[PDB]
């Protein structure tokens, strides 16, 4: 029976904190929780359990309520002052080779269509589409391009809105 | 500072259990308590404090509840087969020299009356009177006398009856 992150036999003399979920025990030192602090918590959830929980959270089927959130985030990007180049599909007149270089184009108008028809089933998929907009930009344009830089800024804004 | 019986600096990585009475912290193993056992208890009294509580039982004030117990203990003694010689005060006619040799006579009837009079305030005082009965008998009679043996038997019965009194 190996307990804790350190995977060691139980030592009757050491201080441990239990995780109800997985029923494992952790040396307060291994998870960095002082005994005084341990008393301040009612239901401790170990790191592994918390990680798995979050991983499962972002993959959970989206609910109508969840969509209120996706709509908000999408609208915030569309309203961003520097988001004008991604509101609609790239126009060849501005970049003749674009659609030959970018195999999976994406834009905010298309994401809006997909949001409306509830095309996304998990938060991960919605995030994938948005990331695609930024990745395509950084891929097509050189790093010293204002557009490449804009993609950088907008993605950080996106990550913040998601938090 | 220094904690536990082992008098050592507090170690954040060690399991400790605290005493409700003295508020000192002790390594579980040092006081004979496993963690699994610790979780099953609300309160905890360390060995030292328990030792003090055990000792002070005879010194604390006697409560109404304790007095019930005094009556119970006394009744068990009065009903004991070996208590026949201590149920009442010695009659001078049966032993002319008795009250001249025994300085502090005592008997179960007198003790029953003292309980009725609420004369005792500490268990130790009740035990002292009981002990007069036995010591007096063993002083006045030879060891091979049935009287002496009755005292020996009743005193060991009494000592047992006293366990867990309060
Ligand atoms: Zn560990
Ligand atoms: Zn866990
Ligand atoms: Zn104590
Ligand atoms: Zn110790």
From Swiss-Prot, chain A:
Ubiquitously expressed, with highest levels in testis. Present in kidney, liver and brain. In the brain, highest levels are found in motor cortex (at protein level). The record marks 3, 10, 16, 25 as: Histone H3K4me3 binding. Residues 61-163 form the Bromo domain. It is found in: Cytoplasm; Nucleus. It comes from the Eukaryota. Changing residue 10 to E: Induces binding to histone H3K4me2. Phosphorylation enhances DNA-binding. Changing residue 16 to S: Abolishes binding to histone H3K4me3. Changing residue 18 to E/L: Strongly reduces binding to histone H3K4me3. A zinc finger (PHD-type) spans 1-52. Changing residue 25 to E/F: Abolishes binding to histone H3K4me3. It is linked to Neurodevelopmental disorder with dysmorphic facies and distal limb anomalies: An autosomal dominant neurodevelopmental disorder characterized by variable degrees of developmental delay, intellectual disability, speech delay, postnatal microcephaly, dysmorphic features, and mild abnormalities of the hands and feet. Regulatory subunit of the ATP-dependent NURF-1 and NURF-5 ISWI chromatin remodeling complexes, which form ordered nucleosome arrays on chromatin and facilitate access to DNA during DNA-templated processes such as DNA replication, transcription, and repair. The NURF-1 ISWI chromatin remodeling complex has a lower ATP hydrolysis rate than the NURF-5 ISWI chromatin remodeling complex. Within the NURF-1 ISWI chromatin-remodeling complex, binds to the promoters of En1 and En2 to positively regulate their expression and promote brain development. Interacts with MAZ. Interacts with KEAP1. Component of the NURF-1 ISWI chromatin remodeling complex (also called the nucleosome-remodeling factor (NURF) complex) at least composed of SMARCA1 (isoform 2), BPTF, RBBP4 and RBBP7. Within the complex interacts with isoform 2 of SMARCA1. Component of the BPFT-SMARCA1 complex at least composed of SMARCA1 (isoform 1), BPFT, RBBP4 and RBBP7; the complex is catalytically inactive and does not remodel chromatin. Within the complex interacts with isoform 1 of SMARCA1. Belongs to the PBTF family. The second PHD-type zinc finger mediates binding to histone H3K4Me3. Has specificity for trimethyllysine; introducing a mutation in the Tyr-10 residue can induce binding to dimethyllysine. This is Nucleosome-remodeling factor subunit BPTF. It comes from Homo sapiens. The gene is BPTF.
From Swiss-Prot, chain B:
Ubiquitously expressed, with highest levels in testis. Present in kidney, liver and brain. In the brain, highest levels are found in motor cortex (at protein level). The record marks 3, 10, 16, 25 as: Histone H3K4me3 binding. Changing residue 3 to T: Abolishes binding to histone H3K4me3. Residues 61-165 form the Bromo domain. A zinc finger (PHD-type) spans 1-52. Changing residue 10 to T: Strongly reduces binding to histone H3K4me3. It is found in: Cytoplasm; Nucleus. It comes from the Eukaryota. Changing residue 20 to N/A: Abolishes binding to histone H3K4me3. Phosphorylation enhances DNA-binding. Highly susceptible to proteolysis. Regulatory subunit of the ATP-dependent NURF-1 and NURF-5 ISWI chromatin remodeling complexes, which form ordered nucleosome arrays on chromatin and facilitate access to DNA during DNA-templated processes such as DNA replication, transcription, and repair. The NURF-1 ISWI chromatin remodeling complex has a lower ATP hydrolysis rate than the NURF-5 ISWI chromatin remodeling complex. Within the NURF-1 ISWI chromatin-remodeling complex, binds to the promoters of En1 and En2 to positively regulate their expression and promote brain development. Belongs to the PBTF family. The second PHD-type zinc finger mediates binding to histone H3K4Me3. Has specificity for trimethyllysine; introducing a mutation in the Tyr-10 residue can induce binding to dimethyllysine. It is linked to Neurodevelopmental disorder with dysmorphic facies and distal limb anomalies: An autosomal dominant neurodevelopmental disorder characterized by variable degrees of developmental delay, intellectual disability, speech delay, postnatal microcephaly, dysmorphic features, and mild abnormalities of the hands and feet. Interacts with MAZ. Interacts with KEAP1. Component of the NURF-1 ISWI chromatin remodeling complex (also called the nucleosome-remodeling factor (NURF) complex) at least composed of SMARCA1 (isoform 2), BPTF, RBBP4 and RBBP7. Within the complex interacts with isoform 2 of SMARCA1. Component of the BPFT-SMARCA1 complex at least composed of SMARCA1 (isoform 1), BPFT, RBBP4 and RBBP7; the complex is catalytically inactive and does not remodel chromatin. Within the complex interacts with isoform 1 of SMARCA1. This is Nucleosome-remodeling factor subunit BPTF. The gene is BPTF. The chain holds residues 2867 to 3032 of 3046 of the full protein.
């Amino acid at each position: 029976k190996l307990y804790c992150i350190c995977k060691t036999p139980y030592d009757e003399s050491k201080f441990y904190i239990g995780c109800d979920r997985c029923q494992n025990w952790y040396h307060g030192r291994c998870v960095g929780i002082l005994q005084s602090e341990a008393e301040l918590i009612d239901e401790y959830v170990c790191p592994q359990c918390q990680s798995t929980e979050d991983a499962m959270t972002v993959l959970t089927p989206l609910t109508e309520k969840d969509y209120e959130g996706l709509k908000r985030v999408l609208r915030s990007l569309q309203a961003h002052k520097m988001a004008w180049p991604f509101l609609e599909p790239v126009d060849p007149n501005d970049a003749p080779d674009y659609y030959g270089v970018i195999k999976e184009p994406m834009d905010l108008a298309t994401m809006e269509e997909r949001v409306q028809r509830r095309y996304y089933e998990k938060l991960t998929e919605f995030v994938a589409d948005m990331t695609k907009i930024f990745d395509n930009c950084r891929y097509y344009n050189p790093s010293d391009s204002p557009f490449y830089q804009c993609a950088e800024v907008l993605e950080s804004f996106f990550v913040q809105k998601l938090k």
